Amino acid sequence: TKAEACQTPCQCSHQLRQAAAHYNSVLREAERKTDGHILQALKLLIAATGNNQKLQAAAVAPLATALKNWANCKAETGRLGTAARNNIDKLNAGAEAAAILANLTKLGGKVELTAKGGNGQLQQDSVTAEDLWRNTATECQIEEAEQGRHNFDPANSSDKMKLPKFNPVAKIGINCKKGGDTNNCNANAMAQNTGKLQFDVKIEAMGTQGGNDAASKWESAKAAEPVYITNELNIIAKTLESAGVANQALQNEFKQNSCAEPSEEYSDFSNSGDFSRQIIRSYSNNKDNEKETTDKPSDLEKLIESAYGKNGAKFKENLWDQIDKLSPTVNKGETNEKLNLKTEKDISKLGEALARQLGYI
Amino acid sequence: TKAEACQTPCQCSHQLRQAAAHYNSVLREAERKTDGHILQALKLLIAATGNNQKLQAAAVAPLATALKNWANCKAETGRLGTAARNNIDKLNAGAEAAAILANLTKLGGKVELTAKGGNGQLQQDSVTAEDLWRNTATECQIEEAEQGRHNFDPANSSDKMKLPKFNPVAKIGINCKKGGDTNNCNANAMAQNTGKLQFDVKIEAMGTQGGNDAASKWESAKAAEPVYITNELNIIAKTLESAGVANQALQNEFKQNSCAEPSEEYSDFSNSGDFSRQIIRSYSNNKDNEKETTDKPSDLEKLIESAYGKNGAKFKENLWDQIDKLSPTVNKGETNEKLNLKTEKDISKLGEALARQLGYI
Ligand SMILES: *[C@@H]1O[C@H](CO)[C@@H](O[C@@H]2O[C@H](CO)[C@@H](O[C@@H]3O[C@H](CO)[C@@H](O)[C@H](O[C@H]4O[C@H](CO)[C@@H](O)[C@H](O)[C@@H]4O[C@H]4O[C@H](CO)[C@@H](O)[C@H](O)[C@@H]4O[C@H]4O[C@H](CO)[C@@H](O)[C@H](O)[C@@H]4O)[C@@H]3O)[C@H](O)[C@H]2NC(C)=O)[C@H](O)[C@H]1NC(C)=O
Ligand SMILES: *[C@@H]1O[C@H](CO)[C@@H](O[C@@H]2O[C@H](CO)[C@@H](O[C@@H]3O[C@H](CO[C@H]4O[C@H](CO)[C@@H](O)[C@H](O)[C@@H]4O)[C@@H](O)[C@H](O[C@H]4O[C@H](CO)[C@@H](O)[C@H](O)[C@@H]4O[C@H]4O[C@H](CO)[C@@H](O)[C@H](O)[C@@H]4O)[C@@H]3O)[C@H](O)[C@H]2NC(C)=O)[C@H](O)[C@H]1NC(C)=O
Ligand SMILES: *[C@@H]1O[C@H](CO)[C@@H](O[C@@H]2O[C@H](CO)[C@@H](O[C@@H]3O[C@H](CO[C@H]4O[C@H](CO)[C@@H](O)[C@H](O)[C@@H]4O)[C@@H](O)[C@H](O[C@H]4O[C@H](CO)[C@@H](O)[C@H](O)[C@@H]4O)[C@@H]3O)[C@H](O)[C@H]2NC(C)=O)[C@H](O)[C@H]1NC(C)=O
Ligand SMILES: *[C@@H]1O[C@H](CO)[C@@H](O[C@@H]2O[C@H](CO)[C@@H](O[C@@H]3O[C@H](CO[C@H]4O[C@H](CO)[C@@H](O)[C@H](O)[C@@H]4O)[C@@H](O)[C@H](O[C@H]4O[C@H](CO)[C@@H](O)[C@H](O)[C@@H]4O)[C@@H]3O)[C@H](O)[C@H]2NC(C)=O)[C@H](O)[C@H]1NC(C)=O
């Protein structure tokens, strides 16, 4: 839907979490496709080493494709998995650090002192407010959620997935009120029972260090205004910088991958040069063929017709349907168990049946 | 080697990071061992489908063990990876949050106001200290490093890998000094030029909410001591609680795994019942054998002597040394390329050579 550059700590937290979740989903995806290919290759290997000579030859070209696809997926999972294990940690820490920053900017309250016993005096009942940073744990409410500034875009469209230059500061306020009128305490002490002195601290996600501004607020008797001090915290920013760099590394690695989706459709095998090269090797008069196609395309189509029907129309009937009829065995204590290759998914059992078949000859 | 229960935010931050790294390194080792077994199995498959009749039979039992080892390592990698995908992010978040808590507890400084122009008056030169929470980014210094409270023990010996209870509080200090003597401001205002009012905030990792204690410090004229307010922040603690649960779930899954190290030593194959069962299947007169040993142990030993020398003493010479001499080919553009099975490590090339071999018969 809408994915826009994050502005607030809460927005950047969700965005960095979404990024990490995206990369993990792509990785899970490549691993599932890898498993699908090796599952196919094992079944084809049982077919390619069986005693059905017609099925034996028909299994070899699809086996070459399944093995290439498997290996490629495996290499791609390794590449993506390597990027993930070197960078996703920095994303997890970034989301947490941004979330804690959001906590800090929402803290409020103050401390207030009222004069007691005399002008400018402080006694046992002088603390009239003390809720500074009393907080209840809540989840950060996303700001402008309709604008989707919390949503992540894996393509980095318009280069928008950038982090703000955070620089957390403590903004300290001091407000002296002489009481009675609205004036400060420049010319009068805090009046007994009415004079007030208020302290607060707010954390801001971005700011600049700066000394107190009492020169413009307490230099004369006038309406009371808080004097502000801004001190650089130098927390959280560096974790968010590292996270930005890491998300950029991950984005580039994960923006593309060549792992192919496992399939039994003939049209997906004909797409493969390994398939066609092996068909010529297995069925033509040149067992040493290295070409992906024949000089006359009709020659290849003839080899395909005899093996899988014209234009591969009998691909399922001649290959997968015959593989389903096989009954290789695995050990089962003192006896054996016949595998049903149409539904068997345990590579341990398939590997065992293949070994037992090769030892049966 | 020395690992103890963590006590400070900095210690617990390092312990949680060590945990995450340990689990990732164990998962990486499982993936390495899986890759070693499938590499071995592919080479044994080339031997088991080659034209050397003696090598063909000698490869099958080791192939059965290799495929079982690979499938078991794949299952354990899946078990460990599922646990890691569900929990390591919480460890990463815990380490960062504890590190940020370490930052917060190190923040010091204060705001100081000095009376100017008269007793209890505040003018443009009244802010005489303003360094509250000025901080430069530094790495947290591990406290009591010789105790090893920052080190993680993956065995959880004596149940020590427990996180402390965290409950961060803001402890606010307010100190009034009348000036002249050491007394507070109960009976006198801040004296001109000498009376001071000091305000500070410290974050503590553990604490309890408590209202101001002016009733015991500002109730009479006496030596000045700061009045304290303690307010509960309800930040960070929940992340650490969730990280502790996550670490316990990961510990249980990662404390053991059955993925075997790939090996070419006969002594590692003789440990496998699959290996011995397949030997009897391939070399005895019972092609349908399902027992892992013969009734007379000497019978199995005679089968081993025939294939791999007495007690496997010729295992390398009859198996691996023979695989090193095979020269199966892969496609190399318009021609071919012979693989050296002793050094080849690309599963794409080995799979292709296997498929070409099977299509060559
Ligand atoms: C405030 O919060 C911020 C975060 O918001 C904190 O910044 C973070 O600080 C982390 C350390 O406190 C830092 O992580 C460290 O980064 C360095 C450099 O990348 C890295 O070397 C560290 O890795 C060690 O520690 C982890 C566990 O924490 C181990 O898994 C790892 O193997 C390393 O262990 C080695 O060093 C440790 C000491 O740091 C030893 O305890 C440990 O035994 C081991 O020692 C051997 O190797 C040493 C190095 O070769 C060697 O000297 C020694 O003799 C041994 O042979 C670790 O990952 C974060 O990167 C950082 N975050 C950012 C974004 O900056 C900050 O600390 C907080 N500050 C305050 C004041 O509270
Ligand atoms: C102060 O700082 C604290 C941390 O120190 C922070 O607390 C954390 O809040 C965030 C949200 O702000 C929490 O993350 C969310 O958690 C909920 C609940 O998940 C829990 O349980 C599930 C299982 O059901 C676990 O998997 C999970 O680990 C938690 O234990 C999740 O439902 C949220 O999911 C969204 O996460 C990503 C976006 O960030 C997406 O990848 C994911 O698909 C989810 O998105 C969905 O919901 C979004 C809105 O929530 C929506 O925009 C999407 O479109 C989509 O529908 C999320 O993971 C985190 O657990 C809290 N940590 C702790 C320890 O409590 C406070 O928020 C902050 N407080 C302030 C500033 O007030
Ligand atoms: C989508 O595409 C955009 C466009 O490329 C990407 O935006 C870039 O994102 C990266 C990482 O977030 C940014 O890199 C960071 O830049 C910071 C600013 O650098 C400027 O200013 C410094 C001085 O302040 C100069 O020295 C420097 O030359 C620049 O002029 C740096 O401060 C960062 O480095 C610091 O932190 C890292 C992290 O620990 C340290 O390793 C460094 O040593 C250093 O301390 C960092 O390099 C980059 O600036 C962004 N480009 C633009 C144009 O803004 C998005 O990241 C991308 N999104 C995704 C998801 O891919
Ligand atoms: C090494 O072995 C030790 C001993 O088994 C393990 O210690 C356990 O660690 C777990 C996980 O950290 C602890 O579980 C957590 O306990 C918190 C407090 O529990 C105690 O105090 C409460 C008082 O409120 C008592 O009722 C209770 O009996 C305990 O004595 C809970 O607050 C946690 O639950 C909360 O947070 C989680 C996280 O989000 C939520 O899911 C929950 O709903 C809840 O809000 C949590 O249950 C456990 O207490 C420890 N056991 C003991 C006996 O100390 C180590 O974890 C282990 N180390 C490793 C690395 O494996």
Author numbering:
A (entry chain D), B (entry chain A): 43 to 403
Paper text:
Long-term immune evasion by the African trypanosome is achieved through repetitive cycles of surface protein replacement with antigenically distinct versions of the dense Variant Surface Glycoprotein (VSG) coat. The mature VSG proteins are attached to the cell surface by a GPI-anchor, and consist of two main regions: (1) a large, N-terminal domain (NTD) of roughly 300–400 amino acids that is most distal to the membrane and (2) a smaller, membrane-proximal C-terminal domain (CTD) spanning 80–120 amino acids beneath the NTD that harbors the GPI-anchor. Therefore, at the heart of antigenic variation in the African trypanosome are the NTDs of the VSGs. These large subdomains are elongated folds centered on a three-helix bundle scaffold.
The structure of the VSG558 NTD was determined to 1.74 Å resolution. It has a highly similar structure to VSG13 with a 2.54 Å RMSD over 324 residues. A notable difference with all the previously solved VSG NTD structures published is the presence of two N-linked glycans at the middle lobe of the VSG558 protein. To date, all VSG structures determined have been characterized by a single N-linked glycan (or none, as seen in the case of ILTat1.24). The structure of VSG558 confirms the presence of multiple N-linked glycans for another VSG. This shows that not only are the locations of the N-linked glycans variable (found in both the bottom and middle lobes), but that the number of possible such carbohydrates is also variable. Finally, as noted in the Methods, the structures of VSG21, VSG545, VSG558, and VSG615 were solved by molecular replacement using an AlphaFold model of these VSGs as search models, indicating a very close fit of the model to the experimental data (a general idea for X-ray phasing implemented by several groups due to the accuracy of AlphaFold models).
